[PDB]
Each structure stands twice: as C-alpha cells, then as structure tokens.
Structure 1
C-alpha cells in the first residue's frame, strides 16, 4: 500500500501525551461500530496484526443516544472495571440496535445479570468511584483528540485512522487495509 496522510490516516494537530498506543472509541448506538464488532471484528484483527504487548484500549462515547448514552458510557466503565467487556459487548449492541430492548439503565443492568455478572457486584461497581474515574477518563480521552464521531481509532495519540478512504468491495480486504494501516502507524 502507498500510505499517504489524508488517505488511510490523518495526523492530529496537537498530539496527545501519555496516550494509549492504540485507542478506539465507539458507541453502542453507532451503526458502523456494530459492524466493526459483529461482522468485521476490527479489534481482534488489529490485535492479531500487532506485536504481543501492544496496549489496545477501547472507550465508549457520550454524544450518541441521549440520556441512555451517558448510562452506556458508565456501563462500559463497569465492564472495564470488572473485566467483562467480552461478555456484554454483543448483548449491549443487539439490545440497543437489533431488538431495541435497551431503553433505560435498568435494561442495561438486566444485560449484565444475564451475562452472568452478579447483581450485587454490578450495583457496587455502578456506584463506585473507580467507575466514576473511568467515566471521566473516557470523556477526557475523547476531548483530548477533539473526537467528533465514531468509530475512531488513534495511534500513539498522533494518528487517526481514516476508514472512509479504504476499499469496501470486500469485508476482509477492508479489515486487512485497516489493520495494516494500524501496523504501519504503530511503526511510525
């Protein structure tokens, strides 16, 4: 591939210090994010292409879904705190976008319970200051990169993926171009 700024990626005006090596932003209300998870598995394939030991971080954003959107950001903090991201990502995505059965914080709770998280453990985490901190962290991270939309990925707080410029004739080619760009940028 011929990598060029503005094609597969763009460069931040003011790079973020102390930024995660690979940082993804998403929303459970975000249509492309649903595809990134369910059929493209972008995170898995980026992880596969990168060396073992490269930190990948994924944060949820507020600016989609109204009142429930903020709650999902807090719910994602709970998932990060308890380490059950892989347990709840699919039922949260489908609960919002597919079945539309997630309409309030109580429905989010039901999802965690059904995924095997004990109710008392969820409630303690939901109300915890560790989780409050994680919400603040997610919000600050987005502000630091002037985040305007999702899905989004940032490499070393300096480069932003540009999927719009990649080939969309074939799902696996799209994933290959995306992952290979992340690899290229990580070595940059």
Structure 2
C-alpha cells in the first residue's frame, strides 16, 4: 500500500458520497493552478469508468471578481460551451495573461471565442447559473480546501499527491480514496 492517510492524503471527515466521485477545485485567476487543471483532465481519462468525476470553481481565488468568474463557468453551461470557454478562461489567464477586470471584459472574452452576447447574457442572468456558483463555493468550504487546484475523492479524502512525482502514483492515491470511507 504505497498510499496511506496522513501521507498521500488527509481525511476531511466531510459528507462522503455513497458512490465514487472525484471533484476538482480550481480558479481561472491562477496560471500555475490553471496549468495543473489539464493534469486533472489526464486523471479523468485514467479514472476508472466505475468512478464518477466532478468539477468545482472557487470564487475566493478570484478575489473581488471571484463571484463573476464562478457565474461565468455556469454561463458556459447554459450555452453548452463549458468545454470550449472553460480553457479560454485559463488560456487568457495562464497564456494571454489578461484576466477579465470587470463583467464587461468578461463578456467580450466569450464573444471573441465565437459565442453570442445575447445567449451569454441569458446565461449569466440565469437563476440556474447563480445557483451553481453558490454550489461549488460550498464544496470548497466543506472540503476544508485552502488553495486550488485541490482534488477531493468521495468528497471526504483530499489528495496530497506530494509523494506521486508521476501521475501513476498520484492517480493511484485517487483510486484508493475512491474506495476510502
């Protein structure tokens, strides 16, 4: 057992899920965090079909505009454009290095990516989006996370992954946490 609690991960004692689920917490405002996100996607493809995966965006990393960034990811969901724009937010941050300063620049980013201001406006003001921004923010609070990217397995074990220099070891910890209760 290469992985053990207190060394490869810690237990939040949070409300664990009845089935295997993995959630990633990240912020569009951290170029280094955004770079790790991709690695989490590698875990998704590697994750066992039995295990479920989930995504979480934190507004506390954003700061004064954290609330806007959370709504923006939810807005993508209304437009079915999460996969496309999601990385656009990380690119613009981790690559263009031009993070949105207001909701206005944020609107231009979506339209630049081929999305409409009309449908994006319907999504940003959709009651569903606002509900999702609150949802993920709660996930980080219960998870006891102090900085993304953070990975939670069964919403109860937190992956340190420090020992795993290579995804093979980091992935293996996630696999055990999926079976941890």
* TM-score of the aligned structures, taking structure 1 as reference length: 0.83
Q: 1:36 & 1:104 partners in 2: Cα distance? A: 25
Contact 2:43–2:171 (CA<8 Å) still a contact in 1? yes
* TM-score of the aligned structures, taking structure 2 as reference length: 0.86
The equivalent of 1:156 in structure 2 is 154
Q: 2:151 & 2:133 partners in 1: Cα distance? A: 18
The equivalent of 1:98 in structure 2 is 95
The equivalent of 1:51 in structure 2 is 48
Contact 1:30–1:151 (CA<8 Å) still a contact in 2? no
Q: CA RMSD of the aligned region, Å?
A: 2.2
The equivalent of 1:70 in structure 2 is 67
Residue ranges of structure 1 left out of the alignment (5+ in a row): 168-172
How has the CA–CA distance of structure 1 residues 176 and 82 changed in structure 2, closer, same or farther, with 3 Å as cutoff? farther
The equivalent of 2:111 in structure 1 is 113
| Structure 1 segment 5-24 matched on structure 2, within 5 A | 5-16=5-16, 21-24=21-24
SS at match of 1:22: strand
Q: Over residues 11-69 of structure 1, what are the superposed CA-to-partner deviations in whole Å (9 max), with x where a residue is unaligned?
A: 113434579711110001124322213xxx22332122222253211111111232222
Larger deviation, residues 146-155 vs 178-187: 178-187
How has the CA–CA distance of structure 1 residues 3 and 163 changed in structure 2, closer, same or farther, with 3 Å as cutoff? closer
**1:137 CA displacement:** 0.8
**1:77 CA displacement:** 1.4
**1:180 CA displacement:** 2.1
The equivalent of 2:39 in structure 1 is 42
Contact 1:16–1:144 (CA<8 Å) still a contact in 2? no
SS at match of 1:153: strand
